[PDB]
């Protein structure tokens, strides 16, 4: 219907590549006692600054700004931690055994043990990065996956009680199909057979189930750190966390 829904696969991929957010630095100082509070402060301060850039990125995802503001809010509230995590895993592919939170903050699982309950999450994130490495995930595939997360994660909770809200839901589903088309087009241009294309599409989308799982566990962890007053959290982070109850 719209200009966004008419884009070709090449146009979609090109737009998503151009929308990529900047890589931000942490505050890490080797002179500081690497305490639970210090590490959590680094991670949440970084997450808060990344969220502002994530909002700008989302507005560049084709069709996203054609949704109502309430729908845009809903999708970002649902997806934000999944998006931070897939970004982290992507940045970490080139560093076996480490998570590149930022160029100055590369942590291994033993460092993750500095925060109660964190090493289990680190291990899941490390396993996902290893999977990306095994698959030789490409940037074009990564950006498609991130756009799929944004559009899919809140879409089952999307209300369609009116003919307009039903229109919005249909637009989201049509755009999800177009991003699938773009992923397949990229794989086909890369020389994969049809069988390999479908197998790889499935492999990539199954990773999204793991990213959802890790986000759920991370949200529980962040709530725990909030409750225990381990770390002060920004107003925006507090609201994003609150949207998950």
């Amino acid at each position: 219907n719209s200009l966004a829904l008419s884009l070709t696969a090449d146009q979609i991929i090109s737009a998503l590549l151009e929308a990529e957010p900047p890589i931000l630095y942490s505050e890490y100082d080797p002179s500081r006692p690497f305490s639970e509070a210090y590490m959590m402060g680094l991670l949440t301060n970084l997450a808060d600054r990344e969220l502002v850039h994530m909002i700008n990125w989302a507005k560049k995802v084709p069709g996203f700004v054609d949704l109502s503001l309430h729908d845009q809010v809903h999708l970002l509230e649902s997806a934000w931690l999944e998006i931070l995590m897939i970004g982290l895993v992507w940045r970490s592919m080139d560093h076996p055994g480490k998570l590149l939170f930022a160029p100055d903050l590369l942590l291994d699982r033993e460092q993750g043990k500095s925060v109660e309950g964190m090493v289990e999450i680190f291990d899941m994130l490390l396993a996902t990065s290893e999977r990306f490495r095994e698959m030789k995930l490409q940037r074009e595939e990564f950006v498609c996956l991130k756009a799929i997360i944004l559009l899919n994660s809140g879409v089952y909770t999307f209300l369609s009680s009116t003919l307009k809200s039903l229109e919005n839901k249909e637009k989201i589903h049509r755009m999800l199909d177009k991003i699938t088309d773009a992923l397949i087009w990229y794989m086909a241009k890369s020389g994969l057979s049809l069988q390999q294309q479908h197998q790889r599409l499935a492999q990539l989308l199954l990773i999204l189930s793991h990213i959802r799982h890790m986000s759920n566990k991370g949200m529980e962890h962040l709530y725990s750190m909030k409750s225990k007053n381990v770390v002060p959290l920004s107003d925006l982070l507090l609201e994003m966390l609150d949207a998950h109850r």
Binding site: I55, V73, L236, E239
Partner: peptide, 11 residues
């Protein structure tokens, strides 16, 4: 309409 996220998305 009062959420921070709502405000940031209008910029």
């Amino acid at each position: 309409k009062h959420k921070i996220l709502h405000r940031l998305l209008q910029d």
